[PDB]
Amino acid sequence: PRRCMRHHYVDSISHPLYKCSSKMVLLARCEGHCSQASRSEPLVSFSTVLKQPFRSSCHCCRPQTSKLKALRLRCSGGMRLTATYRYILSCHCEECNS
Amino acid sequence: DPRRCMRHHYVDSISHPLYKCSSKMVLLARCEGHCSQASRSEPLVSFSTVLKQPFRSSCHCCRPQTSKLKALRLRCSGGMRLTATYRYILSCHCEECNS
Ligand SMILES: [Cl-]
């Protein structure tokens, strides 16, 4: 089966540079195999050599809708610091380059 | 031999989209298949104002790996000679959507 599904997991958010207390939060990701085949066929040009010579279709498992989240970290030096990220609510198969 | 990323041959009629021309039949190739790799998309974290692209993604697509540039002269009604170009695909493979 393993089609484009939404998946829950937990992770701990840290600042990549500063020293802060790890806060762990529930996240979601999209993952799976879109059923549609991907394809790529040549375009014909009477004007120029084509910068992009190919017409293609490719479906990828991506977030369809998501909710923005804020997160404050207790960072050393009495620093309060805030992080943003998007909690994924639904996933779908979507064209690689819309 | 499953339905994976590979080359397919077909003959196609080349014609100008605007001008009247004597069409030419040519052998073409395209890529088509199902890459084994699962696609995925995860949220990114940022301490700036919200990120414009909030997700890091992986997605493999069946694309031309190698190709040969072709040209073709079409005879057209106005006595005009029109030259088309296209790429003859030589090999296909699964490649990341972004690049
Ligand atoms: Cl010529």
Numbering used by the authors:
A (entry chain B): 36 to 133
B (entry chain A): 35 to 133
What is the paper's account of this structure, in its own sentences?
Unlike Wnts which have promiscuous interactions with Fz receptors, Norrin specifically binds to Fz4CRD, but not to the 14 other CRDs of Fz and secreted Frizzled-related protein (sFRP) family members. The Norrin mediated pathway maintains the blood-retina and blood-brain barriers and regulates angiogenesis in the cochlea and uterus as well as neuroprotective effects on retinal neurons. Our crystallographic and solution studies further reveal that dimeric Norrin forms a complex with two copies of monomeric Fz4CRD.
We determined three crystal structures of Norrin, using selenomethionine-labeled protein for phasing. Each Norrin monomer comprises three β-hairpins (β1-β2, β3-β4 and β5-β6), a β7 strand at the C-terminus, and four intramolecular disulphide bonds. The dimer interface is further stabilized by extensive hydrogen bonds and hydrophobic interactions. Superposition of all molecules in the asymmetric units from our three crystal forms with the MBP-Norrin structure showed an average root-mean-square (r.m.s.) deviation of 1.5 Å over 190 equivalent Cα atoms. On inspection the superpositions revealed a high degree of conformational plasticity in the β1-β2, β3-β4 and β5-β6 loops. Conversely, the structural comparisons underscore the conserved nature of the interface at the dimer core.
